Symmetry: C2
């Protein structure tokens, strides 16, 4: 309707000006010697979610105006569905909270409320928005999201539909949200002593932010818990359907991530700690890593997209399939996937094992909004196939 | 359409955040000893226009959803008219320029561009938006506005329709725009010497901002030029129609303003300058002023609104007329007109003759966005009558 589109504009406009204010405050009110990297590592876990939901608004727009008819296969109410403006304005509104909380971290108010609470105000109000019991703030759709999350986070005993699989593949590109929540727990165990001045943005002494209980231990577990839940979900689909080719090949592309991060974590804890003879010892686990990324890339480009098949494919479109529901321009980007799958797998190796600590908050902070854009491309070119198949 | 409503939201959101930034910069980046009053007296002539156009968006909304059918009597194309969102987003966009220019006056950029140009950038880009020759930025409607302004500012030889009269009555509440343009000419003749530091916001020495050529002279002419053009326009309607009661009574309510400001200006220049014996000498010209304001108020409440007539009026609505097109709530406010007509006439006496120089930039700056709201109420309760009569 007109009010929802007006709220889309209102939240996008407030988001644009507060983003410009964020850039201007980061440039002309830069910190003297305090580390900005804990602030980036906490607020990245909100920025990626908001960018995911804004790109999901573009995703629902693309499915709406291409004959995808996503309400048939998501198992939704076709009379009362969620249009793309509703996702746009939810993404905008959460962006307003994110920008206001980060401006509160920059421009600190009076000394009664220190600067550390504002990230908890951000994430707590996002959760309180999510589990609002009976209010009108998306009662129908968000409780479907909560039941979906309950069925996804408990992978056994629940038969997977499509929306279960779809959002379990959405956690595959939003693993950094769980990483940043775990880092927020680690940082607030590090700096619960308030001093009433700076909870966030500590001094140039990092106070051992890389040291914790079970170094490269449970951090890899919080890393791999989306890949693990999607692996067990695909195994439950194997227990139900008992069809080999769409399942065990699909289970392999997350078992590869489960192996790769674990082997890179043992590399990371056997490089700094213990015998540092691993110059050729884990050189095989970068060729295995290359195979484990090309495996997911070929799976991403051949069967969930169906994107080039010489078996009953149209001759003049080697790029695309036999029949395509997207229009002629905005082509089926194999390039934006062949680069950003590599970017995602470099990043997922970097921001968990901390191979490069000097670049662990720049490479990850650049490549994670690019891997969200890769997942944005994935949504178009997977639901051009699920409607067809 | 959806894109225009999205732009309404976008411009309203950017306007809201830049307004909050304006308040925060005026509070926490307050001037030490520099006078803020030239800055207020220049930017009030943009703020009143933008508030007028935003309230005109609410006006077209009110005429659209009450059966007014304003396209019949404005002599417009009913297939291609201007909806209320278009006025909302034009008002929003000009608000974006106004807030950006005033933030440029607060947060000054580098020394190549001084702070004085930004008001000329504001008003020059507003004019360049207005007289855009062939671009798509409202080609159809704004050239109708330009031909309307050419027919209004040249009152003889042009037969008045309704839109001519309507916008000539819109200059009756936007006289402060002409005052602030004249003050901008006076201030830039005062401070054309740049010094590359502060064109706007001079030091506590005002450098004789009340002294000019023909003190209380041509300033009263620029004051009374909307009332004068509406007076001659009503006289041309008397030359055409030759009907006495809707015309000479209508001519009287602007001849009263033409007399009142002139007599108050001679009071102002015979109080500070010359013999200051006018303690009872012009005391009759505040009772005459009271009669000259009640004359316009009774004209505003009896015949252009028709708002209470015991001759063939409905019995249970003493507040309203026999048949009313607005719905039951949001009543026909005689109170918001009986107060704000007085507020407008206090203000129009203050900001031209400068009776109270210490309150000449606070009383005027408060009461002029209230007189624009009075004109906003006038638009509803005049076009509830012109459709009926």
């Amino acid at each position: 309707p007109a009010w929802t589109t007006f709220r889309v504009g209102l939240f996008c406009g407030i988001f644009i000006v507060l983003n410009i204010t964020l850039v201007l405050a980061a440039v002309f009110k830069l910190e003297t010697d305090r580390s900005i990297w804990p602030l980036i590592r906490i607020y990245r876990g909100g920025f990626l979610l908001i960018e995911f939901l804004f790109l999901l608004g573009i995703n629902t727009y693309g499915w709406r105006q291409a004959g995808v008819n996503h309400v048939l296969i998501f198992e939704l109410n076709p009379r009362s569905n969620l249009s793309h403006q509703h996702l746009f304005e939810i993404a905008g509104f959460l962006g307003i909270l994110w920008c206001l909380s980060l401006l509160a971290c920059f421009f600190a108010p009076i000394s009664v409320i220190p600067t550390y609470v504002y990230p908890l105000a951000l994430y707590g109000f996002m959760v309180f928005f999510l589990i609002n019991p009976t209010k009108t703030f998306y009662y129908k759709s968000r409780f479907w999201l909560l039941k979906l999350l309950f069925r996804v986070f408990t992978a056994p005993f629940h038969k997977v539909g499509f929306a279960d699989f779809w959002l379990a593949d959405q956690l595959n590109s939003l693993s950094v949200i769980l990483m940043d929540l775990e880092y927020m727990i680690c940082f607030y165990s590090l700096e619960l002593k308030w001093d009433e001045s700076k909870g966030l943005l500590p001094n140039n002494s990092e106070e051992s932010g890389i040291c914790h209980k079970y170094t490269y231990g449970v951090r890899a577990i919080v890393q791999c818990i989306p890949a693990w839940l999607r692996f067990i979900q695909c195994l439950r689909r194997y227990r139900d359907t008992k069809r080999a080719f769409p399942h065990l090949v699909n289970a392999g592309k997350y078992s590869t991530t489960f192996f790769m991060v674990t082997f890179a974590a043992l590399y990371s804890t056997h490089k700094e700690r213990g015998h540092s003879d691993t110059m050729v010892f884990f050189y095989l686990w970068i060729v295995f890593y290359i195979i484990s990324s090309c495996y997911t890339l070929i799976w991403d480009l051949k069967m969930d997209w169906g994107l080039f098949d010489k078996n009953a494919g149209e001759n003049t479109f080697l790029r695309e399939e036999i029949v395509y529901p997207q229009k002629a321009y905005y082509y089926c980007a194999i390039i934006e996937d062949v680069i950003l799958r590599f970017a995602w797998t470099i990043q997922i190796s970097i921001t968990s094992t901390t191979l490069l600590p000097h670049s662990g908050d720049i490479i990850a902070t650049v490549f994670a909004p690019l891997e969200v854009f890769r997942r944005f491309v994935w949504n178009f070119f997977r639901l051009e196939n699920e409607h067809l198949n």
